[PDB]
Amino acid sequence: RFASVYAWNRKRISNCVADYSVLYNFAPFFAFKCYGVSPTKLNDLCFTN
Amino acid sequence: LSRLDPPEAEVQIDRLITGRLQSLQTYVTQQLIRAAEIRASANLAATKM
Amino acid sequence: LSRLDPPEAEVQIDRLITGRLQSLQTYVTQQLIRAAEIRASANLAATKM
Secondary structure (H helix, E strand, C coil), X not given: CCCCCXXXXXXXXXXXXXXXXHHHCCCCCCCCCCCCCCHHHHHHCCCCC | XXXXXXXXXXXXXXXXXXXXXXXXXXXXXXHHHHHHHHHHHHHHHHHHC | CCCCCHHHHHXXXXXXXXXXXXXXXXXXXXXXXXXXXXHHHXXXXXXXX
């Protein structure tokens, strides 16, 4: 289940290992655009939240 | 360099290079002006001596 | 102007215009400084004459 564009859902991710490879290697993601970050570099970065 | 990939980071690197080059050019221009001023002052001091 | 359409050639020529104008401006500023130096030297030469 996914929420409507209004009253959209919001989930906070913190204190965990982010394996963006399993996210990029998904087939149905026909559109994948990142701003200020390159998908190939996600696995080497760390964020505050 | 860490966040972006070379293709899209080239524009940002070029922007920063342009900014820093212009800053250094202005700095050296001011330095040349002050050097000419101090050269005139040194000529006056030598004449006075 | 050959291997690019005019719309993109506009933003690709912006760089050449600004860079060559900055180069000519730097040259003219250096020549102004040198001309001030030469004017001082010529004034000294006339006084000595």
